[PDB]
Design a protein around this ligand. Structure first.
Ligand SMILES: [Mg+2]
Ligand SMILES: [Mg+2]
Length: 429
């Protein structure tokens, strides 16, 4: 089969590198001085490997070569969990026959793959390492500094990785908790390969991604729905934070919206997961929101300890499934039942709230209802996924139009969408 890589990635603010290196040196690990890693990644003209979330490189460490294939896995905040397979090489030339068949989607290497792959991008960086023990786990800390480059287009590498060599993922999260007491770290959801692929397309500006309806598997239980909901909210926070720190000022609003979605998900599942399961998480989210609101700089806001601690708290809560020990028998029964059936009930609950609030025109008092309206839209986004996507998104579009118009003060559009929303019927059972 494949091996399994588990590592937590933090992007490091450039000014914080020296202070980080000093801190890492107080942990009492086995330290290795920087070594240059030279990598070339390979890809076809039709972006075949990228289409499968899989990356192929040859790594050089002082004339010693290694071929590595990573395949589709999971990214949760900064935590990358990818299957991989590494093969030692005698010289820098690919040998695709050495990889197991389970690497390939069809169980067979495409006939022309070796012939049509070209060098698409490189990563050239110096890696400094600390090996540390946390409980019964062993973790390799890597500090990477250099470049990722696709022809003309390059961007800096300045990041920290905590790779689990053996043991438990909880140990990685424990280690992270010590490090985010100081500024200069943010969880990074983009692999070096993902950034390399983007540069190779001419490094176009990334666009804001509005949240769309969550689609959870048929037969999923409520717990699976909950996991998918929090995965989505964290992914939307990560994506928009990356855009914001890269210079998109409009993305700030979407960072706050994603944090709002976390809160609304906690409320949605609050009949099952008690409020006390998320006391500390919600406290940290409040301080993060305040820091974001008052920030003069995206860089300062994003690399702050308020943001760092709040984000790590959410990642840990999700990955550790921290709700589980709080569930009594009744709650366990409800969380193990159908998400589809749960969703039908809660769609009606949120529709009742929307109808009662917006059945009449509200004059100068629309803006005070924004939090309620936003909660209900967010809740329906998480719940509406078992129906026809065209019908369901069309239903939501009218409430979303109302929310936009209220937020920007468009009097005509407020009344238009309020009427459209009150004239449409429900789509659910
Ligand atoms: Mg890595
Ligand atoms: Mg690694």
């Amino acid at each position: 089969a494949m091996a399994q890589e588990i590592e937590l990635k933090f992007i490091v603010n450039h000014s914080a590198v020296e202070a980080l290196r000093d801190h890492l040196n107080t942990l009492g690990g086995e330290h290795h001085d920087p070594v240059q890693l030279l990598n070339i990644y390979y890809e076809t003209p039709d972006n075949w490997l990228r289409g499968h979330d899989m990356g192929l490189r040859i790594r050089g460490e002082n004339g010693r070569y290694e071929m590595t294939m990573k395949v589709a896995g999971r990214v949760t905040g900064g935590l990358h969990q990818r299957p991989e397979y590494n093969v030692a090489l005698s010289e820098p030339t690919l040998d695709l026959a050495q990889l197991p068949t389970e690497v390939w989607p069809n169980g067979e290497l495409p006939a022309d793959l070796a012939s049509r792959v070209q060098p698409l991008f490189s990563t050239d960086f110096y890696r400094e390492k600390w090996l540390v023990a946390v409980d019964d786990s062993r973790i390799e800390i890597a500090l990477d500094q250099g470049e990722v480059k696709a022809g003309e287009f390059a961007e800096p590498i300045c990041e920290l990785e905590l790779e689990l060599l053996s043991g438990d993922t909880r140990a990685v999260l424990k280690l992270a908790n010590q490090l985010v007491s100081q500024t200069g770290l943010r969880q990074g959801s983009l692999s070096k390969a993902a950034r390399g692929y983007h540069l190779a397309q001419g490094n176009p500006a990334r666009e804001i991604k509005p949240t769309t309806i969550l689609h959870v598997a048929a037969k999923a239980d409520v717990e699976q729905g909950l996991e998918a909901a929090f995965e989505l909210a964290l992914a939307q926070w990560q994506y928009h934070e990356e855009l914001w720190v890269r210079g998109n000022d409009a993305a700030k609003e979407q960072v706050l919206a994603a944090i709002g979605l976390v809160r609304h998900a906690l409320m949605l599942f609050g009949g099952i997961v008690p409020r006390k399961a998320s006391t500390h998480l919600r406290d940290l989210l409040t301080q993060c929101e305040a820091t974001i609101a008052s920030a003069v700089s995206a860089v300062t806001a994003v690399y702050s300890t308020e943001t760092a601690m709040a984000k790590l708290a959410l990642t840990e809560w999700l990955v550790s499934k921290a709700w589980q020990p709080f569930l009594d028998a009744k709650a366990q029964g409800k969380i193990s039942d159908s998400f589809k059936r749960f969703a039908d009930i809660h769609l009606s609950r949120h529709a009742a709230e929307l109808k009662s609030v917006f059945c009449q025109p509200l004059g100068d008092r629309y803006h005070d209802q924004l939090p309620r309206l936003t909660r209900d839209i967010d809740s329906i986004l998480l719940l509406a996924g078992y129906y026809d996507p065209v019908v369901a998104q069309a239903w939501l579009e009218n409430w979303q139009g109302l929310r936009h118009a209220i937020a920007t003060g468009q009097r005509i559009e407020i009344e238009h969408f309020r009427n459209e929303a009150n004239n449409q019927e429900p789509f659910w059972l």
